[model samples]
Target: AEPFAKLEQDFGGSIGVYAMDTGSGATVSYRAEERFPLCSSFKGFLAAAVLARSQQQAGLLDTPIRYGKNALVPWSPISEKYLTTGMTVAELSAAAVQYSDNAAANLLLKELGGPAGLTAFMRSIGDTTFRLDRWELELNSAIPGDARDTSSPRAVTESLQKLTLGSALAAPQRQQFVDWLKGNTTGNHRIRAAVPADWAVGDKTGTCGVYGTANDYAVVWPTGRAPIVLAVYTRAPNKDDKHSEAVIAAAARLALEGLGVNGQQ
Candidate 1:
């Protein structure tokens, strides 16, 4: 049986939405368990891996990474800036997450133990879709590989629950990771849009091209209610801002309302 008849009925296209309340242990998903290309969202997992491993090695998060002439990829926003010559891990993360910088992500991908490390880390987290056997040559293009770093709506929510519960990372490392997530560049309208400005939201957004699709997974802690996590992926019938932001907003509003967090202010 189809679990998300209503979602399909409303969206009129392939849409996935998932929500779970960690405090109450309730889950609601609409095709939310499906795997979609992560796009820029891959940076979140990459960031986590770097932080977790760095902590284990007793290393500095701000340690510098150098990008020589050939090391940098062409046609990248970061490359146009000429700032990739040398920067710290923290700087790379800031650029990667905040600005969705591709060069920074590639560099960090190499730093966090390369494709092998990414594959191993995803496996550790129980994600079978995220195969890192080959380099994702195009920032926006996904290759046909063993697995496509897929995140089910439930998987994303579950991951956040583990992070909050301190089961995902070591005590100190988990706290730091969450703090960094709070600074993510993607939480504008979907998850935290209607909520009060002071409400805490930590999330990442992903997009590749006109048909790129938008993936937004958020962990929200309102003033009183138990935290709720929601993951939304929207691929437009036609690539446009209307489909990109508005469709996602509609899905998120529905999900949040279903969770009984209406009038978030």
Candidate 2:
């Protein structure tokens, strides 16, 4: 069913949504195959890739990093605060997830060997649709029809499921990934807003400047039921079009309704 057709219309943008019920294998997909800019959302996977490395390297997460001021980039809230104090790989990963820290993300991306390396990690997990073509700031360009630093909603949800709920990461790394996402502070107005207050939700969000490009992907746990993994992404035609958090929330509510697990449904 094209459940999000009208929602996309009302939002005056292209809406991509994919929701999965892991236990039942039920799903709702709309424009799920189409690409959308990743923005800061890649930080989630960047952190996951770091965790993957941790499993093979003892004390890797504990390795301290004290980057100079040049490493700090715009919108690096968490990294800026810890600049003088420094942080471990684990803490940097957490900051990248929880605060969308740009510096933390870049530092970790460097550890993974840049954008191509991150893409390689996704391919290692059998996800061919994921790609990261550039670094932060430049990657957020969101130019219409451009494919750099983009991934489909379906791919995002699948990769997220693997890293957070599946065995893509080792057991300990998986839980740590979930913990970092659960502590996320940047997605409250996105998918998290539509989730039931009592349910557990961990999400990563991205907002590309203008072009109405933004996205959120999440793993949601309903009491007495298996988890749901979903992604909602949006983009518009015009240069200055604004992305709406409310629209993303609405799209998520519809997805939850379709899955028959939304608390109010």
Candidate 3:
């Protein structure tokens, strides 16, 4: 924990972390109770809720949804190519997670019955600290005092734990979610930066401009050992900042080392 404490001081900003060993249930926490904007990390939870609902509805995943011109948002991969096409829920889920597509996420949120559905799903899983109050486009438009989508380090860690452990979805559904996380490419400089190349990390990245927010949450499968659930959150003041990203990478390395794994492949 000394390294983690040092990381907070060196980062010179708010940093939260919660890491747990899936096999032994051992954990390390720092400012785990503090709340931070969920950003795109909320997509993982939303995807879980969607998949669970799809199970009951039958063929929901195959059902088509449309993303019109109005749904287009800058910095979205899906919007660039499929602005006015119909896509299945499964396709949108993949784009949302893999590329952190805002347009796809907005559409998925609508398909899931808006923010209320996401809130209900989180509550059903015993998560009260995580809140989903608006669509991706409305995130920055929240009133000064009103709540936007937010979550604590502990809440995210627990949610991911439940997700990977088949508590939130059935086994097949859980694997599907995991695969989507594995396909994510947005956090190369964060958690993925510290992980060994040979090891597999299923993760999602959330960023809110430079110095705004940078976070990465993942389930790391180490060679011949148990998977580790880790969540790191940083809130700074600038756009596309690297300080928070470096802090997260270093923290991930330390967390792995603490668990007796070599972070370098």
Candidate 4:
């Protein structure tokens, strides 16, 4: 029995999923090409772009950026804590990915030349479907039918695979990107919940605070197997509909099961 339709129905929303096993070219896809709000998830790619730049400009990651209290925005724990002395470019990137720090993201967005610059970076990496048309709160609108700041589940997983595993980024920066993802503090209840306890997993999460829109994407390593990359995104019909972490976790489990991963023969 295919699981997604029933799962989406129970959650009263649409679910988009895409998972890939790099070694075997096997996949589990559902609404994989559909557009979903990026929410805070764009920070993951934003960090990748920052690393991409570091490869060309020596010591770029060590450059520090200081901001005023005025730069602080809601949900910027990491940035807020370091407001006075400021943080280096690498630290800002880490804060953006690991904490989804809104202020840190905006600051980095400026550093990379704003939303357009990040979009340009994605294009350079061969991801045609990715877009970042706005900054922080505005991008989280998640309005139905609007394409701004959205990318398909397939695109997310593909770009993630490229930047994190493939040659899209230089070797060292690539590992740094993966390391920041592995350190993410926000994904515990989402994809991380569904993965086997022994498997190594790193993920980033997003909750748009509207329309029940939320998502999680990850790279998971099962012992003795190639890494798997997957994205699970959800959206509902109403503006006030609530997002559920359990639903996302269950959806992740289904994707992994579909791939016959996690000790299955």
TM-score of each: 0.83, 0.97, 0.91, 0.98
Backbone clashes in candidate 1 total 2
Collision pairs in model 1: 129-149, 130-149
Note the residue pairs that clash in candidate 2. none
Regions of model 4 farther than 4 Å from truth: 263-265
Q: On residues 1-265, what C-alpha lDDT tens digit does candidate 2 reach at each position?
A: 5558888888899999999999999999988999999999999999999999989989999999999999998988888998898989999999888888889998888888999999999999989998999987789999999989999999999999989988899998999999989999989998889977888999999999779999999999988899999999999999899999999999999998999977674
Which scores higher on lDDT, 2 or 4? 4
The list of candidate 2 runs beyond 4 A from truth reads 1-3
Error of 1 at 215 (Å): 1.1
Comparison by lDDT, 2 against 3, better one: 2
Q: Per-residue lDDT for 1-265 in model 1, tens only?
A: 1434554555554567878876776766777666665677777777777776876766557687767766556435654475645778877776676667777778888876776787688678776655444444454553222134455665665665565454767887677667767887666866667566877888877775645366777778877788787788755354442335556766777777777776544
User: What would you estimate as the lDDT of candidate 4?
Assistant: 0.93
Q: Local distance difference test, per candidate?
A: 0.67, 0.91, 0.80, 0.93
Model 3 quality (TM-score): 0.91
Model 1 residue 61 CA deviation (Å) reads 1.9
Backbone clash count, each prediction separately: 2, 0, 5, 0
Between which residue pairs do clashes occur in model 4? none
